[PDB]
Amino acid sequence: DLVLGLDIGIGSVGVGILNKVTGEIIHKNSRIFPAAQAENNLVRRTNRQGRRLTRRKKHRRVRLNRLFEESGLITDFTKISINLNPYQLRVKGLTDELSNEELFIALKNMVKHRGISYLDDYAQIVKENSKQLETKTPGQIQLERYQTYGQLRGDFTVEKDGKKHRLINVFPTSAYRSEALRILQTQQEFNPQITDEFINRYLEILTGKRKYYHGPGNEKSRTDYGRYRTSGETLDNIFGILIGKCTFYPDEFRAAKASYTAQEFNLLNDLNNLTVPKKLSKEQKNQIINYVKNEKAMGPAKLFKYIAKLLSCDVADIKGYRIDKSGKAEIHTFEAYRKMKTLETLDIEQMDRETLDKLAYVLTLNTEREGIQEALEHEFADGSFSQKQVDELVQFRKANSSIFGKGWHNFSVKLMMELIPELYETSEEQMTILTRLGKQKTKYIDEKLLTEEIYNPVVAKSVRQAIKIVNAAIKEYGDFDNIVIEASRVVLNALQEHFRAHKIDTKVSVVRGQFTSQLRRHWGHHHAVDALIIAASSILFSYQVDSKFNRKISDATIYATRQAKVGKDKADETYVLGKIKDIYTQDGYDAFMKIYKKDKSKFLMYRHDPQTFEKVIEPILENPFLKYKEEHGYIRKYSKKGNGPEIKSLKYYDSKLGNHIDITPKDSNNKVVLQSVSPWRADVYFNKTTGKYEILGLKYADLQFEKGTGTYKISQEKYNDIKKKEGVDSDSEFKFTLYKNDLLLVKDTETKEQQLFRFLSRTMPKQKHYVELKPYDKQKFEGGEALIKVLGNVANSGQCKKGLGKSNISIYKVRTDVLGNQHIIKNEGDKPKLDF
Amino acid sequence: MKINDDIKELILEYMSRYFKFENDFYKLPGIKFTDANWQKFKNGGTDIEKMGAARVNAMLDCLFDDFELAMIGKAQTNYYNDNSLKMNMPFYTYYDMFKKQQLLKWLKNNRDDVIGGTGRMYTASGNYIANAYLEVALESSSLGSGSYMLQMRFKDYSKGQEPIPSGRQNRLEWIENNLENIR
Amino acid sequence: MKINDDIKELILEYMSRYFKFENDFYKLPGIKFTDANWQKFKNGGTDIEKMGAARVNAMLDCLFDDFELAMIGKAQTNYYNDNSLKMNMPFYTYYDMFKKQQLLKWLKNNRDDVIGGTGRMYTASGNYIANAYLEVALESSSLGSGSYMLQMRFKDYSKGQEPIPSGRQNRLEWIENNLENIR
RNA sequence: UUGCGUUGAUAAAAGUAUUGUUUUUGUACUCUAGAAGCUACAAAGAUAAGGCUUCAUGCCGAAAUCAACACCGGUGUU
DNA sequence: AATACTTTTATCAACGCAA
């Protein structure tokens, strides 16, 4: 006789338990978890399919080097000159002879920039930039842009003799193939070592592209993101395993909407729902099926005229038809069958029934030439389709995009073949036939069925946490009599199906929150006592630990540093730079005055070119940069005559340098860093010599994939380096590790006082053994709240950062289960876990 | 192993190799110089034979691996027993020759066993240097928890802007073709 | 390898193993103690972390081989990173366990190249000990005239009063037979 | 709750283009053939730290799963 | 890092027609 009550929220779940007779409070707690925001898999998917572009670009360059090396043209690749002009070499080698090194630079600059290929306001600009390709290659266009305007790449506006307009470096990849073919034909006329297999291999390197239904991989690479699966199979179309299953047979794929069986079912079910003054017989049904099959032009109007003349009364007497948006008569015909009868090379009249279902599976899935030309080989019988037939159905499916791009039926052919003999004779719908035919963890409740039917990502996490709470409660306190809860109907049906198939009756129910707000208005930690109210209608905390190791280690932005003396330095220190982009923009001028007022010498321009800083000091004084821009043009540099370059940006000494990763190149002169490095966990050590604790701190960036096997670990020598830095002696002993949201008990040893916090991180990496603590009961730790006598006060901002290398404290680790029953440990193992 | 002025020149040369700024080296825990004491030690001032044993054996361990401290004793053995080597070159050039000969014996006898990778060195503030050296090991002498018994540590001096490839075959083939640009 | 309080005990234990009198050890020209300072060092009066580098490395070079200082470094890593190893034994017992582990791993893989020999450790009396330790080495890592790259020394704790059989095959069979006694 | 027909949102996965940040080199600008490395432009390398084998339309690396230990999908306790 | 382009599969909502 116990009652379970749950409060299912966004980021927390409350749970309470009653006894239903005396009404005593047995248990009450709250599970706290992060809310599953959908912005994180977007960043992971964006960077996953954004590293593949860089990888395949580099592999194009590698394949080009192997092509030049194998055909004997170039032996070593060390002395190729970086400082030539590739565009002049392309336009020159159209009609001259390039001596095996200019050809390399030309073809490499070609494969580094190929073009768009989807054309077989942005499209208006590619329309403007494509009319000059009727007589010129793109190399000629970019060369005239280079020697007329000076600037080639990017997107940039300019004023010609007529009018100001826009230039963009996007050309279609047909013109690059034409230009490369002309270049290689001329060089074949000069150099007799360019074979036709050389130019064919280069042209397959240039314009090669995978298709959207192929995905990554190779025959022997075997990734599980495209076809060529890790199980040894090979798909034809990686969307062909995403097709949903049948409603009443959960092992059969669905049927294509333009098959024979689906249209037969749709017409046989469309006019059994039609009442004529009292349903149509089997003979007239077979007649109307043969009349809509053997007819060149059918419609929804001629069907109503034909049934009106077949039952001889009139047209307007009939009711039961499906109306439209604008009120009409809509009814299924054999639209894809009448349309597929317009094929002169292949005859479908004496063709089979299942063959008309695989032809609609292939024409519904595959949309391109190579897809349909490849999916007619494996599935169908060997032969059975000549090449002219294949090309005619390819241009048939390309001509009918609205008919074949409809989708997939909600049943299967295996089920729809069990109803078509039935709804001939007995005039009924599909639901009454399926009703009169009846198609339709061992102790605990498994989560795979119930998360399957949740699709909002915030709700499914709360549902799984509530399921885990229910599983722990019925493991601890026997069984209940009521399970009351708080997307909603499906957990009701799931718990009802679970308890119904287990021959034990418990009342599982939902209740509305308006009733509970009414109860709180009438009757007179926030989740706990409200869940007790839910269980009354008929504390302890349990946080979720974050212990995932491969996360974002740092930014991807590359920063530049300089060694300077800014302000009150005694010696040269390293400084992270910044940059004001687009000085003419209003935010650029506000940021320029922001840098300029507090320190004039923070700019790099003021220290190295001071003369031209006496040409920027007048437009800020007597004129601000956008007015000078529209008056005389851009704010050019200082020279004797006006040919100095323009000014669009200004870089300055931003800040001092803190946590970083040093990724300076080989031949560099200044230090080049990555910033914003985040912590992961902390290990706690203790030594009996002094009698105080020591605390390490690891980051996400400290681990790596190791060098022989690829496993993700940190070695022991690097671990000893981190131990030497953080002040941990070598004869200390290891207590435990703390991840995020772990409960940490601090106890004083002189006056026996106890508190417990949540671990957050290991801040301030200049002092030693400093740790940031989050509160146990609440979620903000706001104010100047006091603490126990040895730690001190919470700071003014609301951030508790305490140095736990004290003289009297003692530190324990708390492991709470889902219900919150705390187990206090003091020694985890002999050795901290480093291999994953 | 002997501690003398040749060990001081070896420490100064390898410190100049792996660290771009000297502040990262002499302010490490265990070494812990000041600026005046560093400018005294670097300019021939203070003796190394009278220094602390812990400080010298902490300067020797950050720059050399635990196997490369075996080839310093054997290099000193073969170097103080030959008049044809003492007059020509200093000690660190002979040490580089010794290390390269042992690498050549590794590549000759045990070619399908040589693995390698990029090493990272921790500076005086804790922030490491990604790709500070190239570490080369023998996989048969694996020891446990990602540590090796026979290990070396090189640095590439190349002019072409093309990094060292990954995988066992490409990296071993790069080391076989560029056996002059690593010191 | 570090220099701390657990290195002095290893030095004293190995000196008690190899030398029959302490006066043969602390009067060697690299070490050069006096009888007051030697008892001050042997009783705990001085700090090994602040001693001169040449003297400490001369002691460690006289007692140990060039290859076994690499094993001292690796054993220090594995020893200080584990809890039961730290708090169940002294360091020299785990060092002898490490040495025996590497010896059996040497015999297990390629036993056809393991050779051995006798050891003559010089003293401060003009004479020496003719047979105090047994050398075991690998034929593949041969350096020069009589130098071996990979080499270890052991001591016979057998109580059968039998001398060493000379030759390769018989000594290999004897060290394989007596694998549980030597340390 | 099962089927059909339109219009709106969301989720998951795939194929491309052009730039952005930074390093070196070249020309221009500046100061006396040198220096300075600011301001432009053009090439070549890198783009979360890193790693793999199958040698190539090559592949993986920023999400989710979570109380531990002991005894044969279940059973025990700080 | 941050804008342009192309494609597929699934799930909810909202209206209409059989039940």
Side-chain angles (χ1 to χ4, degrees), chain B:
Chain B
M1 179 74 67
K2 292 167 166 52
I3 311 298
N4 43 6
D5 273 8
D6 296 325
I7 307 294
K8 188 203 282 167
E9 312 309 309
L10 184 69
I11 284 172
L12 287 192
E13 157 89 8
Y14 273 66
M15 177 265 311
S16 157
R17 286 189 199 189
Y18 299 142
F19 296 89
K20 189 163 60 49
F21 293 137
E22 289 172 5
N23 309 79
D24 307 341
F25 182 67
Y26 67 82
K27 290 190 171 172
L28 273 174
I31 302 160
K32 203 90 171 193
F33 276 105
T34 64
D35 299 62
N37 278 254
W38 183 245
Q39 287 290 332
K40 175 167 177 176
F41 175 82
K42 202 176 67 183
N43 285 288
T46 172
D47 199 353
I48 189 153
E49 293 157 60
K50 307 291 201 329
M51 273 164 61
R55 160 176 282 185
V56 172
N57 269 100
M59 294 170 80
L60 274 178
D61 203 18
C62 189
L63 303 168
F64 299 98
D65 204 356
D66 306 271
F67 179 68
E68 287 173 295
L69 292 159
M71 292 180 278
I72 289 183
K74 279 295 164 57
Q76 284 183 317
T77 287
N78 286 120
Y79 185 76
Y80 296 135
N81 276 343
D82 252 1
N83 285 31
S84 316
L85 301 176
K86 294 163 85 160
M87 283 186 40
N88 298 84
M89 48 180 183
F91 181 58
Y92 52 91
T93 314
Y94 182 60
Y95 175 62
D96 293 320
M97 282 176 37
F98 203 84
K99 202 155 71 160
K100 194 188 162 186
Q101 277 177 337
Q102 193 87 44
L103 174 65
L104 268 161
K105 270 191 283 180
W106 276 9
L107 289 192
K108 172 170 63 61
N109 303 6
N110 314 315
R111 196 190 150 272
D112 295 313
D113 213 354
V114 176
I115 70 177
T118 62
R120 44 181 74 176
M121 185 89 74
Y122 275 74
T123 73
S125 43
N127 315 306
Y128 64 96
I129 304 166
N131 189 82
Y133 49 88
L134 168 83
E135 48 192 2
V136 169
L138 264 182
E139 209 177 7
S140 44
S141 54
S142 163
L143 207 144
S145 189
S147 179
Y148 286 83
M149 190 64 204
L150 303 194
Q151 202 158 19
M152 282 173 196
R153 171 184 304 199
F154 296 94
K155 187 195 193 53
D156 55 331
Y157 288 123
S158 298
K159 321 294 174 80
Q161 37 181 13
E162 202 86 58
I164 303 175
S166 300
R168 182 192 203 89
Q169 195 196 289
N170 317 322
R171 206 182 276 127
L172 174 61
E173 183 166 345
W174 187 95
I175 292 171
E176 276 176 348
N177 304 337
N178 293 54
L179 205 66
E180 192 75 355
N181 302 323
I182 41 176
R183 289 204 268 154

Side-chain angles (χ1 to χ4, degrees), chain A residues 639-654:
Chain A
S639 184
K640 44 194 73 165
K641 58 185 179 293
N643 52 7
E646 286 143 26
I647 286 176
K648 311 155 178 182
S649 76
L650 288 170
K651 58 173 62 157
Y652 59 96
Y653 296 104
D654 196 325

Side-chain angles (χ1 to χ4, degrees), chain A residues 41 45 51-52 55-56 59 61 66 82-83 87 108 114 152-154 210 212 218 221 322 325 332 410 430 442 461 547 550-551 553 558 609 637 639 646 648-649 707 712 815:
Chain A
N41 188 268
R45 190 210 305 133
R51 297 184 292 239
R52 291 191 168 115
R55 160 165 90 205
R56 282 147 172 163
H59 201 63
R61 301 197 286 257
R66 291 176 185 172
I82 295 167
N83 282 315
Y87 307 96
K108 173 170 168 166
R114 59 188 204 194
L152 195 148
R153 296 191 62 189
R210 309 183 168 250
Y212 66 97
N218 196 8
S221 287
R322 265 170 33 210
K325 292 282 151 299
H332 282 130
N410 262 310
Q430 37 86 22
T442 43
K461 189 158 186 151
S547 44
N550 198 344
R551 275 188 193 258
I553 67 156
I558 310 179
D609 267 33
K637 211 186 169 189
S639 184
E646 286 143 26
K648 311 155 178 182
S649 76
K707 70 167 154 168
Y712 204 70
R815 273 189 192 149

Side-chain angles (χ1 to χ4, degrees), chain A residues 742-759:
Chain A
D742 276 332
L743 284 187
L744 184 73
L745 203 144
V746 180
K747 161 205 288 184
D748 207 312
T749 43
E750 203 48 86
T751 73
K752 318 316 177 175
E753 184 66 13
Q754 299 192 349
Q755 203 151 4
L756 59 97
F757 306 91
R758 286 182 291 157
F759 184 72

Side-chain angles (χ1 to χ4, degrees), chain A residues 389-408:
Chain A
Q389 314 206 318
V390 168
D391 180 49
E392 275 206 6
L393 51 86
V394 158
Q395 62 104 30
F396 176 75
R397 192 257 180 267
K398 187 180 268 225
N400 319 280
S401 157
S402 316
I403 286 307
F404 276 140
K406 285 278 172 285
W408 303 86

